Symmetry: D2
Subunit: 115 residues, 4 copies
């Protein structure tokens, strides 16, 4: 899959397991159509989201549903979800990994773009 | 203002000046309604966004136009906008400071919530 | 003070109060010599560490006693101390603000350097 | 290896390649003795640092030499190196991965502890 999502839990120092992830692609009407989704594995990773054929250039939104994750651990978080909006570009490297580091009130989202 | 946004540049170690920030509030019909907007000052902070009277309970979206900030520095970044979605004032009125740290391929969001 | 340290709690979204901070300066013989120390205030900031006259060029080590902060909250964290090692005033005198964000298994260090 | 180091470059959105990493263990005299070292691979990862037999409980320091990395990319950084001081504990999970996210003026170090 040209798009992968990896999530780490900075409170427990663990992969963030069973975190729902939703990917949307922006349509011609400037609305977000569902594109792909899943839940992170025991390794905190979500594979198989899409294929090279389906992941064409465009604007994508990745929603990592962090609020539900922290609620299940018993910690009240700040945000509804971590949101990454980005443009997929064919000229750059072929694989996009969205790496999220989560704490309840602070979090980072980084794109590692490789091939 | 009960809502304050601070934007910093992690490449140069400086405040991020003149960055556009748009705040939306989810309406009854689930659409994002415009709420407030402004641009960060020389300190990287955006003050005067709203007031205690206007900033009622709700789901807010803070959109930091950030790709634009980096492109102004000659950097083609990964993400279009930093986006922070949070429920505000659900336990009663609070003061929210959202600090966004900008890197070309990465964004960090931190919220300090006080009384 | 040309050197300011701010400590924030990423689990609770609050300043980190009463955190011990020790600053060292590398001596001619390569040992770390004590330079200044203090404890963060209710805002999470430690002011009054040093002066323009005392903070000369050199290699400085900022040690944030942080494992101790987390252990006081009932959290057994990964790291003993947040540690920031930097050369200061090598291009001339500057003002340094170091912001440390504390999580149990993670620490983030940000420096804002101004004139 | 029970200890692994992974490093990401938030300016380029890439693994941080060829980054020198030094691990020290604290001795009875409170001095840091060299323990293991290496340089990150094309994946930004450093494998084979140690073995379960050699990595006993104690206090360890991981120095990721970030200054040299940013100098080779043409960006003046804040810090001499990212430093992680931590205590290895036999009761917890067996594998420690130190995950570093680097920008020139802001960086995070997280321990992912698994088995």
């Amino acid at each position: 899959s040209p798009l992968m999502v990896k999530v780490l839990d900075a409170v427990r120092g663990s992969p963030a397991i069973n975190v729902a992830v939703h990917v949307f692609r922006k349509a011609a009407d400037d609305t977000w159509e569902p594109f792909a989704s899943g839940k992170t594995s025991e390794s905190g990773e979500l594979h198989g989201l899409t294929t090279e054929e389906e992941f064409v250039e465009g604007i994508y939104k990745v929603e990592i549903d962090t609020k539900s994750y922290w609620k299940a651990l018993g910690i009240s978080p700040f945000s509804e979800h971590a949101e990454v909006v980005f443009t997929a570009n064919d000229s750059g490297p072929r694989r996009y990994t969205i790496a999220a580091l989560l704490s309840p009130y602070s979090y980072s989202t980084t794109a590692v773009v490789t091939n």
